[PDB]
Design a protein around this ligand. Structure first.
Ligand SMILES: NCCCN(CCCNc1ncccn1)C[C@H]1O[C@@H](n2cnc3c(N)ncnc32)[C@H](O)[C@@H]1O
Ligand SMILES: NCCCN(CCCNc1ncccn1)C[C@H]1O[C@@H](n2cnc3c(N)ncnc32)[C@H](O)[C@@H]1O
Lengths: 342, 342
């Protein structure tokens, strides 16, 4: 299928084993911003669900399907590929909703639905929005969407902004300099120092931060889920031209994201911005191995290219330059292996 | 090969990817008790290495191979299956030891060695000794061992003892009881409570503790690496009969291990006991889902059975009973996915 074609088997095995744990579902359920905002978006747009047909893509515990049932849905197909499906089925029986929620085990790229749906709901966002490549499954699910059907969430915005954080930058060399020792128990390790540095800088940094580190207004890249095709996410090119609001050393780019549920009654936003309450997505920072000096009023221009790989993630390429000086920095990160710094 | 036949491919992929990171090698090398004790064992038994042939099983960075070279070895074959092999070769060239240390990339079950060896050295101990199933690779390497050849380490002792720790039990139980909620955002989760508790209680707890929690003298199970066959580790049965020294609630069993390097000059011990300075193995505790009340002078009898699985780990069954009352507890733990509590 489409999923098997884009995913190495080892990665899929690990991924669905991970999501088969109740502790992981629980971790996501306990994110109050996430769960509360989803419930609110669904219940306050009750006309988009009352007596409607719903598809829940990757239902996990089934929480969103139960929210759709609370809003009056007639029939909800809840698709889930990990062993969590079995758990979801138990919940459906214990909440007396067997006539309204049908759990379907398997991948949404491989299962069958008995009918087309009025609305698709899902929680397909990973770190930096795109991690885990679940958005593609979400977009794939539009083969089951009736003409003029809706999607919750409806659109996604990724934000990027340059930051300064001298201590974060320094920590990488401090860790790597373990190898810059000529007699570790009699062994000269120094020839690996460079490799160590490289390894640490290929990891995106997952945590939160004070907004005062941001040096320019963010640039936005938008995916409209009603319109986008799976193939649009294999190569994501984000050009940027920042007008520097503060002078300093740019140590890298920070990323966050919002999604919007565009309903008939109201639009509801779920934001992971550093100006908003913390979520379990935090924010993501990609460091430059060579920082760039910038003056307030200078322009920092370049490109962030995200190239989808078969490990359900992206290879990140960031090229940036300060236009007033021509000083450049290029960087390659592996989004599959972030550094959880919180 | 033997390795591929006993190992799922997804697990092997993840395992060797994990050991390909310099940060992980660094973490293990920085355990000074481990590294220092290995160097001491090898250097103080220099006659076991001087002008000898050595096989280093899973050399990683190559540190033990460098130790063997310091002790005067003539030739060291250092076998490594992750990409760390490449890094090891770098070090071998930068320490001017190309004439003595030969890095051989691949699994020790699959490579070819040009000659038989006088001594096999390795660091094959995981959490609770047996995790990672690396001991079997170590034992497999005995196909290259000359008659009357030695192994470093030479023997392993696993220790088990009953413990009381109300706070640990309560912390796990509280995490599980999220799934006892009858109205999580209006949804009844309580039918999964039993599942939740099972999941949480099958993760062994990796951390250290004060020895005052131990309620009886430890029982010892010994594996002699000079004598054991690979097959002996597929099913490890450890019967136990504890004489309770203190009254209270037995919340589970604590595990640690020692290894001995039995050399021609002296025997050197590396201990992970809670009475000894801390190592990065810590100690491991398997909790009982239902604790057992015991009085001082009672006998707590049963069996710990470890069944090797294809995920490079073991399914652990612990059955224990207080003989004086017939109170029993049965437990299944998944050693592959511990809870790292430190
Ligand atoms: N709301 C219900 C839980 C939604 N889960 C959200 C994960 C993203 N969350 C997150 N949070 C913090 C940091 C990073 N990421 C994802 C769930 O979708 C399931 N699945 C993923 N692909 C699937 C596929 N192609 N076919 C069927 N099922 C699929 C998956 O097995 C998981 O159970
Ligand atoms: N000191 C030297 C580094 C030794 N590494 C020690 C592991 C210690 N485990 C542990 N666990 C918890 C806490 C602390 N330590 C293990 C290394 O052996 C490598 N490997 C594993 N199987 C192999 C195979 N069948 N054939 C070839 N290579 C093999 C592995 O790739 C790793 O690099």
């Amino acid at each position: 299928s489409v999923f098997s074609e884009r995913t190495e088997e080892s990665s899929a095995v690990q991924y669905f084993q991970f999501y088969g744990y109740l502790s992981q579902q629980q971790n996501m359920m306990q994110d109050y911003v996430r769960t509360g905002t989803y419930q609110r978006a669904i219940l306050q747009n009750h006309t988009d669900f009352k007596d409607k047909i719903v598809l829940d893509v990757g239902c996990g515990s089934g929480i969103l399907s139960f929210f759709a049932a609370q809003a009056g849905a007639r029939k909800i197909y809840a698709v889930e590929a990990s062993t969590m499906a079995q758990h979801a089925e138990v919940l459906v029986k214990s909440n007396n909703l067997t006539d309204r929620i049908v759990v379907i085990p398997g991948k949404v790229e491989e299962v069958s639905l008995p009918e087309q749906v009025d609305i698709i709901i899902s929680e397909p966002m990973g770190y930096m929005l795109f991690n885990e490549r679940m958005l593609e499954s979400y977009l794939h699910a539009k083969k089951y969407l009736k003409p003029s059907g809706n999607m919750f969430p409806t659109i996604g915005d990724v934000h990027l902004a340059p930051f300064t954080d001298e201590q974060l930058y320094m920590e990488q060399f401090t860790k790597a300099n373990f190898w810059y020792q000529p007699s570790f128990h009699g062994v000269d390790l120094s020839a690996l120092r460079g490799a160590a540095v490289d390894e640490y800088f290929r990891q995106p940094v997952v945590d939160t931060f004070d907004i005062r580190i941001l040096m320019a207004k963010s640039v936005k890249y938008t995916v409209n889920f009603l319109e986008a095709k799976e193939g649009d996410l294999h190569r994501i090119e984000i050009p940027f031209k920042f007008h520097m609001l503060h002078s300093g050393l740019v140590h890298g780019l920070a990323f966050w994201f919002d999604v919007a549920f565009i309903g008939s009654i109201m639009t509801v936003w779920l934001s992971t911005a550093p100006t908003e309450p913390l979520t379990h997505w935090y924010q993501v920072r990609c460091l430059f191995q060579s920082p760039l000096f910038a003056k307030a009023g200078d322009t920092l221009s370049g490109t962030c290219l995200l190239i989808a790989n078969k490990r359900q993630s992206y290879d990140i390429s960031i090229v940036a330059q300060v236009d007033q000086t021509g000083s450049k920095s290029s960087n390659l990160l592996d989004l599959k292996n972030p550094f959880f710094r919180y």
